[PDB]
Amino acid sequence: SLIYTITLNPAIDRLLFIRGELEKRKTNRVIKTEFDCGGKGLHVSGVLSKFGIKNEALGIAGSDNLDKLYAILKEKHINHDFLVEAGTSTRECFVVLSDDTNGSTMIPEAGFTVSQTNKDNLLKQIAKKVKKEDMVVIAGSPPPHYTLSDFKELLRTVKATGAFLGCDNSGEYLNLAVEMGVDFIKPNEDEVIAILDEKTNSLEENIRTLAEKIPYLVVSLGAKGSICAHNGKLYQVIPPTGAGDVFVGAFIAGLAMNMPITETLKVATGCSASKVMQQFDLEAAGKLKNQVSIIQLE
Amino acid sequence: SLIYTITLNPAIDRLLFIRGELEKRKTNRVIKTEFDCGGKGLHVSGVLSKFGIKNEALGIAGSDNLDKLYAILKEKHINHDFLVEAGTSTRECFVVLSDDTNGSTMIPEAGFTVSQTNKDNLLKQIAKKVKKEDMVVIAGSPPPHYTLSDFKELLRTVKATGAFLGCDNSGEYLNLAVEMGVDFIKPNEDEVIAILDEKTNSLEENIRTLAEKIPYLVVSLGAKGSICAHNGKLYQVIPPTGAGDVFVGAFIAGLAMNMPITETLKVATGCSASKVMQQFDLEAAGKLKNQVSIIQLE
Ligand SMILES: O=P(O)(O)OC[C@H]1O[C@](O)(CO)[C@@H](O)[C@H]1O
Ligand SMILES: O=P(O)(O)OC[C@H]1O[C@](O)(CO)[C@@H](O)[C@H]1O
Ligand SMILES: [Mg+2]
Ligand SMILES: [Mg+2]
Fold it and tell me: Among A131, A145, B76, B273, which residue's Cβ finds the most Cβ atoms within 10 Å?
């Protein structure tokens, strides 16, 4: 079988290294510039590959900076079959970083408007490629004007093939994903409250309730860690940006390698924490795996 | 005669429009992206052209994004004869702006290392082009590793042709410019103190003193306005980013059109203020010209 990632609104991450903090009306000189691939799906493909797990990235890229995007993907050993929109450029997400600090300021471009033709090409692309034994991971939110309506066809077209379907989205797209019934989603506390529009029950109850529709539910609680529901059980995951994408990637890898869920959660969490410490190193992420603690909630 | 601008470290300004202020560890979504030419020299060429004054821009651009730089220049009606460094890209200066606010955060890339060959090509380029009746305006500081030594040849090579030479630089380059004896420079208060390394005399005296070497000395005092020395006289210019580049451009234009110095100062100052009000419009800058007041210091 195979794993497919779908990055509707890909990007090129441009790391801008400056000295100290980022003043907000001052001039901040860049010491050096660094590039990496952007888009949730892509980040997820990057993790899968480090795990020696086969996968292919799908999405819509711009023509004008394609060569640059491909060099990065080749470097991150990411197999892809992108659709290309002529006369446009993949957006960039400027990441103002710093060795002198541990912060990061994000300034992502909105991305371009996708042509109707490439929307349809993505649909058959999925029909022609995805099998029931495969897994699909639509990650990152849609580019401007890729409507909820468009998103609906996308999800249904995937479901129609019977493959595992995970979605890392937000806003009405996440809600929509839930209503459609995907196998995986990683909402934050508040997104959970939003999806249900319920504010009087405990979060726990919101999650157990939501687990009735999503079989691999993982709710991020920020620094506190996470809560994952699966097979009737609820787990509190306690750890010792892009951290969320790596978590997804790691989590998918675990399921792909078919390892215990509690175990998958320790690996996912070890890799996510491994980055919140990096400007990730898989080897380095492995030392954190067994520092992660799981607490089953009864 | 003709005017030449020299932008040793050109750039492409990428305006990033977000909502409200710029948080510094948050994600700031870009509403729309806009491009403009970067580099002091170029900005100066942009002003000259709006004044219908003939000029040509010189400098070293990268190959990978040349087409994009040329489209902008064509749009700003800027004539150029750039030298090109193969396999490299012109740096970008990210300008985080906002309609909801009147601020701007600058994040300029350092730029690339220029090849020895293009350093030399710039030198003969100047010898073959510049005549005594022309004006040269080296503006913006040098790219990484374009040494003080390199800068020395540049300036001397221009002087050797007998043309008017203005320099808008900083750090040791500005000092060097002063020692070399250029016709124009626009240092800020502190740069003046630095050039002389004198801290016990009034700024006025520092300027009159410095005027002995620079015949068109203009010292910027920030919000307070400016002080310009010329022909033995000292003027306090009182007004009603990129504002400095436009001032230079406007000032050069005045001298080019050979209009009174006090007058040149009112135009330069009107145009600079015209931008500190813009996200400049020449027509709009004209309404501010006669709101500028000149006070001769005796
Ligand atoms: O796919 P999106 O939802 O548009 O997000 C893209 C952004 O996500 C990040 O990976 C942060 O999670 C950034 O590096 C940037 O690439
Ligand atoms: O030529 P430099 O000294 O490297 O400065 C370039 C920068 O100058 C600015 O025009 C501000 O004066 C920015 O827009 C950016 O292009
Ligand atoms: Mg999210
Ligand atoms: Mg200056």
Answer: B273
Closest-CA residue of chain A to B20: A24
- The pick from B5, B13, B76 for probing ligand 2's pocket by mutation, whose C-beta has the most ligand atoms within 8 angstroms, reads B13
Whose tokens are 């310009």? That residue is B228
Q: Give the C-alpha separation, A268 to A290, whole Å.
A: 11
C-alpha span between B248 and B166 (Å, rounded): 9
Question: Ligand 1, from A14, A34, A40, A60: best to mutate by most atoms within 8 Å of Cβ?
Answer: A40
Rounded to a whole number of angstroms, the distance from the CA of B20 to the nearest CA of chain A is 12
Q: Name the experiment that determined this structure.
A: X-ray
Report the amino acid identity of residue A140. G
| H or E stretch covering B296 | strand B293-297
Phi and psi angles of residue B277, each rounded to the nearest 5 degrees, phi first: -130, -10
Range of the domain at B187: 1-298
Say whether B275 counts as a known binding-site residue.
no
Residues 6+ apart with CB under 8 A from B146: B8, B9, B114, B119
What's the token pair of residue A159? Answer: 């479901």
Alpha-carbon gap, residue B285 to A157, rounded angstroms? 57
Residue B186 assigned ligand-binding role: yes
Residue among A21, A25, A106 whose CB faces B28 most closely? A106
Number of structural domains (chain A) is 1
Complete edge-to-edge strand list for the sheet that includes strand A233-238: A83-85, A55-62, A3-7, A135-139, A164-168, A184-185, A216-220, A226-230, A233-238, A293-297
Q: What resolution in angstroms, rounded to 1 decimal?
A: 2.4
Measured in angstroms, how far is the CA atom of residue A283 from the centroid of ligand 2? 43
